[PDB]
Amino acid sequence: MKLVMAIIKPFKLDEVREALTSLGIQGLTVSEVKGFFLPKVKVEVAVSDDQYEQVVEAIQKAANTGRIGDGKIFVLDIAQAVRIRTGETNTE
Amino acid sequence: MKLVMAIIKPFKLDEVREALTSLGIQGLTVSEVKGFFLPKVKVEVAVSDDQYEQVVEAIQKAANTGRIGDGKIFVLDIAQAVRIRTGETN
Amino acid sequence: MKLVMAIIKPFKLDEVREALTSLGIQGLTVSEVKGFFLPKVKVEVAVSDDQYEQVVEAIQKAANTGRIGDGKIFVLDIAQAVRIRTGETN
Ligand SMILES: Nc1ncnc2c1ncn2[C@@H]1O[C@H](COP(=O)(O)OP(=O)(O)OP(=O)(O)O)[C@@H](O)[C@H]1O
Numbered sequence A: 001m002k003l004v005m006a007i008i009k010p011f012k013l014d015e016v017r018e019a020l021t022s023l024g025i026q027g028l029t030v031s032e033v034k035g036f037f038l039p040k041v042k043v044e045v046a047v048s049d050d051q052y053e054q055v056v057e058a059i060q061k062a063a064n065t066g067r068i069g070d071g072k073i074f075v076l077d078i079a080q081a082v083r084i085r086t087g088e089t090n091t092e
Numbered sequence B, C: 001m002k003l004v005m006a007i008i009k010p011f012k013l014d015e016v017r018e019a020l021t022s023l024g025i026q027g028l029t030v031s032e033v034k035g036f037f038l039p040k041v042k043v044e045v046a047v048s049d050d051q052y053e054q055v056v057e058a059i060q061k062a063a064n065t066g067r068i069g070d071g072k073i074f075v076l077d078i079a080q081a082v083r084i085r086t087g088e089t090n
């Protein structure tokens, strides 16, 4: 499992959300941050190792303008995940 | 150490905090985030290897309702933790 | 690559930014968070493996007061980084 974190230009949030939803990705978490400043949006989603490359590609293509300030996507390893509703624990 | 990250329903924060305090945790970081919008709370706490699973389970039990939208808890490895007050590691 | 995450007293942000800038690190992400509450600032910066320890030390020295509430620095491994502007993987 991977945590995919992207810092994007705020106007690109709708396109990024759209791209992820088409991939069938659920549980997008979004926050407003300051980018060094200019307002940025941080998007975060946890995905299977099987899905992370498609997720990264989808975010990159949706968030891209080619101009300065486009931002970054960081992928981090998740060792364990628990579904709070059921208490069930998953690992890959 | 491990970074325990949970995305919970905002009204569950008090119960989650109470459970963590009972474990002797106390130090934790809370962010206001948006789920998909629905308001959510992101709780982040770095915990020793000896206690991380107990922290996960404490958060799970406290944040649980059995309803849709309860959220998830993620565990990530921390390679190095520094206490800013003293500069000590891990 | 490493993700350096620091939770600091808000008034220390400028000093931390100055230290990072002197190291040639201008790109960083700042969030307003709640620390258990008191307002805190989360600084996130992805840095190369060869520089992360120098970065951690620089942040610690700039953010330190020696008093309670100074905060924490966590270092996490980054599995992959992509530059959105070009689509290139680090
Ligand atoms: N190394 C980094 N660590 C953390 N956040 C970063 C980092 N680099 C960039 N960011 C975030 O991304 C936002 C946009 O910066 P970006 O990645 O586009 O860098 P840049 O200096 O504009 O270079 P370029 O756009 O040409 O790649 C920043 O304001 C910051 O919020």
Ligand SMILES: Nc1ncnc2c1ncn2[C@@H]1O[C@H](COP(=O)(O)OP(=O)(O)OP(=O)(O)O)[C@@H](O)[C@H]1O
Pocket: B027, B028, B029, B030, B044, B045, B046, B047, B083, B084, B085, C007, C008, C034, C035, C036, C038, C040, C067, C068, C069, C070, C071, C072
């Ligand atoms: N284990 C932790 N996990 C996540 N965030 C933490 C943790 N410990 C501290 N923090 C964050 O750092 C902020 C400052 O707390 P700090 O680390 O200074 O702890 P403290 O109890 O004041 O101890 P001391 O300052 O003596 O080290 C907290 O309010 C919280 O946002």
Ligand SMILES: Nc1ncnc2c1ncn2[C@@H]1O[C@H](COP(=O)(O)O)[C@@H](O)[C@H]1O
Pocket: A026, A027, A028, A029, A044, A045, A046, A047, A085, B007, B008, B034, B035, B036, B038, B040, B068, B069, B070, B071, B072
């Ligand atoms: N895979 C995921 N990655 C990151 N955050 C998630 C994920 N799934 C759910 N969330 C967050 O948790 C909230 C409730 O999710 P859930 O209870 O799992 O439907 C959502 O609104 C998201 O903000």
